[PDB]
Write a protein that binds this DNA or RNA. Structure first.
Ligand SMILES: [Mg+2]
Ligand SMILES: [Mg+2]
Ligand SMILES: [Mg+2]
Ligand SMILES: [Mg+2]
Ligand SMILES: [Mg+2]
Ligand SMILES: [Mg+2]
Ligand SMILES: [Mg+2]
Ligand SMILES: [Mg+2]
Ligand SMILES: [Mg+2]
Ligand SMILES: [Mg+2]
Ligand SMILES: [Mg+2]
Ligand SMILES: [Mg+2]
Ligand SMILES: [Mg+2]
Ligand SMILES: [Mg+2]
Ligand SMILES: [Mg+2]
Ligand SMILES: [Mg+2]
Ligand SMILES: [Mg+2]
Ligand SMILES: [Mg+2]
Ligand SMILES: [Mg+2]
Ligand SMILES: [Mg+2]
Ligand SMILES: [Mg+2]
Ligand SMILES: [Mg+2]
Ligand SMILES: [Mg+2]
Ligand SMILES: [Mg+2]
Ligand SMILES: [Mg+2]
Ligand SMILES: [Mg+2]
Ligand SMILES: [Mg+2]
Ligand SMILES: [Mg+2]
Ligand SMILES: [Mg+2]
Ligand SMILES: [Mg+2]
Ligand SMILES: [Mg+2]
Ligand SMILES: [Mg+2]
Ligand SMILES: [Mg+2]
Ligand SMILES: [Mg+2]
Ligand SMILES: [Mg+2]
Ligand SMILES: [Mg+2]
Ligand SMILES: [Mg+2]
Ligand SMILES: [Mg+2]
Ligand SMILES: [Mg+2]
Ligand SMILES: [Mg+2]
Ligand SMILES: [Mg+2]
Ligand SMILES: [Mg+2]
Ligand SMILES: [Mg+2]
Ligand SMILES: [Mg+2]
Ligand SMILES: [Mg+2]
Ligand SMILES: [Mg+2]
Ligand SMILES: [Mg+2]
Ligand SMILES: [Mg+2]
Ligand SMILES: [Mg+2]
Ligand SMILES: [Mg+2]
Ligand SMILES: [Mg+2]
Ligand SMILES: [Mg+2]
Ligand SMILES: [Mg+2]
Ligand SMILES: [Mg+2]
Ligand SMILES: [Mg+2]
Ligand SMILES: [Mg+2]
Lengths: 122, 134
RNA sequence: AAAAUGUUUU
RNA sequence: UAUCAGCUUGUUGGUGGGGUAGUGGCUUACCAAGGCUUUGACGGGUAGCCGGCCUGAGAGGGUGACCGGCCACAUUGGGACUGAGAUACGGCCCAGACUCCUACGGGAGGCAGCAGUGGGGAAUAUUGCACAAUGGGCGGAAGCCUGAUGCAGCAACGCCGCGUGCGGGAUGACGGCCUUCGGGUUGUAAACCGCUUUCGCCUGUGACGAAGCGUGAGUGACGGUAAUGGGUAAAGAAGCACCGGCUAACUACGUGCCAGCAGCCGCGGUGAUACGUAGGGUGCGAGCGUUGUCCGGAUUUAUUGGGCGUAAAGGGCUCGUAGGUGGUUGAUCGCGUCGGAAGUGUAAUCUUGGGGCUUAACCCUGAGCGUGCUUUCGAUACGGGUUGACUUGAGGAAGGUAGGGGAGAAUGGAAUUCCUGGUGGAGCGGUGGAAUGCGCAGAUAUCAGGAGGAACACCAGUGGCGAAGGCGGUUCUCUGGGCCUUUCCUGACGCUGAGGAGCGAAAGCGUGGGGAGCGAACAGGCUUAGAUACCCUGGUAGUCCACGCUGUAAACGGUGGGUACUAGGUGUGGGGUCCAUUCCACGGGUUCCGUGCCGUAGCUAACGCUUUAAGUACCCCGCCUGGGGAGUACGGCCGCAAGGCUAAAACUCAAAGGAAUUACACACCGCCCGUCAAGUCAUGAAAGUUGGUAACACCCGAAGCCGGUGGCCUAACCGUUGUGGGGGAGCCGUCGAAGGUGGGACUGGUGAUUAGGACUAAGUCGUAACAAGGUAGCCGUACCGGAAGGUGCGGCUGGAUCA
């Protein structure tokens, strides 16, 4: 565009889409497990991915993935929910922080323990 | 209609130099004559001449004769217009532009007449950055 | 001269 | 932010008065009718601003913690009082909401001071010490006060520094792990030998900050602190992430599309370097990862620094308003611009030079920076202002001139159809083949006569004209623009143009007319698994006319307008002018303006473009920012309607796409479209229903200031010493928070029902597109149909046959 066109109407940037609206500017949010279940992944891929409908303290209810082999949380279990997308799962944009609040660390972890909330074993 | 006769001079020179023409001609103006003079003094054209009208009998004609070196080699690596009519560019005595790392010359119209950057910097005078001929 | 279609391997 | 276009009536100005520290509609009376606004007023949304901070090559982008400056506020709303000074945080008055005391009559209170509690939250500390230092208040002073401040506690929250050992040690030991059973690896690692003592722990010494303060005596909260001597033992002191690619670092075992991993590409279906564990390794290290957020990479909003023929992108076209922009030149101004000077840009930060903490972080100090602004003095090349010339841009005159440019009216012939008559007799028509249909009630055919509507063979394309859409019988009338020309005239009058206005194929709509042919819909016949199609026979709107409306097209050259420059070659349309023979014209040239093809430089991803640019440049406008959702919803405008214009978001995918090579590449047993059925997610409509915010018009109206009044109460003043002056309570009036009442505006949730979108069975129904996709496809519009789609009308080539 001409300089006069830029003067009359300047450049405008893009919108910069948000990824995790339910957190509302917080690194993680507390919630209650309104439902605990399993979902089939999209294709390709095939499994029984463990997820939970959680009512976060922001008043929004979202689906959160439960990582790691092992699971204890059930109905009305208080959880901490952080960001994180599961690519082969449409509509899952959050994960549950293992080792925090009611959810507990994966039992037999010995590598990458901190990411699954597993205390070091003597 | 014609908007920037200086840009017309620059593009005429660029096109003629690219097409390997020995001479180019245009309607004459004082600033065009000054730019041609400093181009000749800096060695980018062989010579220049202002001709009294005898074909159109209307106005003076400025004619630039260019120089090509051994094996038909361009003496002008390019010319660019800086202070456009749509957006004019003025440079201070400290912020004078450098062309081709200093190899080329920026033509600056200062309050003391047309002066190449090197000159201006020596006189510590700025002005309107007309061209970047290199 | 008209004359349709071709699931999910691993 | 325009999906907010009108706002304001003390409002804008004037005069007099009042008021105030002070100017002022600050207030008041009177007069006038202003003021603001598409260069965005008013309204909505969000927000304290800045020095700075983060990021970045820079330009920028994000941000406003500590520290420092300004502002605002102190339970919410309002008000004044006192004072030099008041949003009066730890004041007062009134009202509201709260909490507390009460003997029920009435009272008391405001941590967004410091610490602290509850609560909310992913998340942020002690109900500490001292006024020793600096700062502040009062006092003549000693001094008193200071949750300012100086300190300490707490937390890896950040930055910085240090330690967890150092040297030697092959016999390359065991043990793990791997193996080709040879060995390899962990690994100089260990064992073993000799050393050192920072930190920690134990113990001793022990400050500076005080050139303070105090008449003196005396006087350090931090504090037995820092620092430092001695002692102990190599000890009390290493984890976290990662190892398919980007990306530094690989193997074994277990698992078997399971369990799981992932930032993207993807991994897992029995040989997993991608899951889990182990050995080994790598990056970091008192940290290491994850999440959130910001900048970078992203030139992915491109001023620096991008684009629009086919990838997303040129408005359908023109006129034209604001605006942007401006041929040659004289003079002048000195606003832009440029150069000095002065002032300012506090400090801190930041850059940098010195200095101090054992180094560093950090701290002090000098300078720079502070990218500007104001004042002032210069310069005049350029931009602009003022002013005067010039003619080459532009327009005009005169003459020459081409044409389907437009509008109106009359009118010509052929052909179709119908009608009348003659003749004549069995079919005609139609197709791939047929049938429906028409025909002995005489069709088809054939001749004559007539009626009527519509379109204009040949000329006619390789062409002309128009801003585009578009424009073809002839004649006349009216009218627009273009081209050329040497003289002539004006003298930059130019270009472009947001908003706005007009024009704008076809279809469509309204009123009236007309209706031959054609022909959506429709009916029938065929084909077919079906055939709501192709094909056939019929056939209504429409096609036509008049006047309006609509305002969209593949409205395409998918290429905005103007200008200058940059090889040629070769057709063709228009105007001149020149030449020879003519004294026509044939011919050649040449010039100006069109319109094609080839083609150089150049450009482009390629295809291709190339003087008619998609090349080199300058001016102005429109437009693009991944694909869907979607040119859809909501709102608004326009319309009689159809609809058009303006124009999102949630959600979803990791592609979509351009050209080309050999819409398919799993390679036609390909690909691929839409209903219907099922599930999931987000969203729209909806009788309604439920909130919220911002105001408005009235009614009432506390405190309070102001203006009145004051019969009541009054020590200073004066008295003719009976009082008066002046004041005060009280009372009234204006304004006035709150409340009440009413009607609107905006907006959130929800809503039976309903609509479409996205994704998922590997469901059902057809095959619409991609090849001539088997009826070339697509664009606008119209009607029809289970659904794709079918058909009519006009258009396009992003189709082709035959040349
Ligand atoms: Mg007055
Ligand atoms: Mg705020
Ligand atoms: Mg800001
Ligand atoms: Mg502050
Ligand atoms: Mg006072
Ligand atoms: Mg106070
Ligand atoms: Mg105060
Ligand atoms: Mg208080
Ligand atoms: Mg507090
Ligand atoms: Mg809490
Ligand atoms: Mg003191
Ligand atoms: Mg004293
Ligand atoms: Mg006290
Ligand atoms: Mg590598
Ligand atoms: Mg295995
Ligand atoms: Mg950028
Ligand atoms: Mg980014
Ligand atoms: Mg781009
Ligand atoms: Mg362009
Ligand atoms: Mg396109
Ligand atoms: Mg166009
Ligand atoms: Mg339009
Ligand atoms: Mg104008
Ligand atoms: Mg000029
Ligand atoms: Mg001059
Ligand atoms: Mg400093
Ligand atoms: Mg030092
Ligand atoms: Mg400073
Ligand atoms: Mg001027
Ligand atoms: Mg004429
Ligand atoms: Mg007519
Ligand atoms: Mg013909
Ligand atoms: Mg043609
Ligand atoms: Mg004249
Ligand atoms: Mg319009
Ligand atoms: Mg029509
Ligand atoms: Mg009609
Ligand atoms: Mg009618
Ligand atoms: Mg038919
Ligand atoms: Mg067209
Ligand atoms: Mg277009
Ligand atoms: Mg235009
Ligand atoms: Mg152009
Ligand atoms: Mg031409
Ligand atoms: Mg291009
Ligand atoms: Mg619409
Ligand atoms: Mg709704
Ligand atoms: Mg009242
Ligand atoms: Mg009073
Ligand atoms: Mg009295
Ligand atoms: Mg009162
Ligand atoms: Mg009120
Ligand atoms: Mg509902
Ligand atoms: Mg088909
Ligand atoms: Mg077809
Ligand atoms: Mg049909």
């Amino acid at each position: 565009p001409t300089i006069q066109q830029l003067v009359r109407k300047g450049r405008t940037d893009k919108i910069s889409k948000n990824k995790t609206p339910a957190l509302k500017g917080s690194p993680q949010r507390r919630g209650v497990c309104t439902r605990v279940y399993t979902t089939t992944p999209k294709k390709p891929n095939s499994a029984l991915r463990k997820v939970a409908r959680v009512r976060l303290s922001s008043g929004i209810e979202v689906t959160a993935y439960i990582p790691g082999v092992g699971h204890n949380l059930q109905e009305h279990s208080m959880v901490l929910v952080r960001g994180g997308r599961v690519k082969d799962l449409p509509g899952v944009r959050y994960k549950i922080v293992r080792g925090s609040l009611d959810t507990q660390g994966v039992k037999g972890r010995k590598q990458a323990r901190s990411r699954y909330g597993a205390k070091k074993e003597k | 209609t014609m908007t920037d006769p200086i840009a017309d001079m620059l593009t005429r020179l660029r096109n003629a130099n690219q097409a390997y023409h020995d001479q180019t001609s245009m309607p004459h103006s004082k600033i065009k004559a000054g730019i041609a003079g400093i181009l000749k003094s800096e060695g980018y054209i062989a010579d220049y001449k202002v001709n009294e009208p005898k074909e159109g009998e209307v106005g003076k004609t400025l004619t630039l004769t260019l120089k090509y070196g051994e094996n038909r080699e361009r003496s002008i690596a390019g010319v660019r217009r800086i202070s456009k009519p749509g957006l004019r560019v003025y440079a201070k005595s400290t912020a004078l532009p450098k062309v081709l790392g200093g190899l080329g010359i920026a033509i600056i119209s200062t309050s003391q007449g047309l002066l190449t950057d090197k000159q201006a910097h020596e006189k510590s005078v700025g002005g309107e950055v007309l061209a970047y001929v290199w």
